Design a binder for this molecule. Sequence first.
Ligand SMILES: *NCCCCCCCC
Length: 18
Amino acid sequence: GSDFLSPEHQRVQQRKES
Ligand SMILES: *NCCCCCCCC
C-alpha cells in the first residue's frame, strides 16, 4: 500500500545522528 520505503529510521520526537 502507500509507503515511500527505507531500510532505516523511525519518526522519534528528536534526532541526534540523522
Ligand atoms: N511504509 C512505511 C514503513 C516502511 C518505511 C519506514 C520504516 C523503515 C525502517
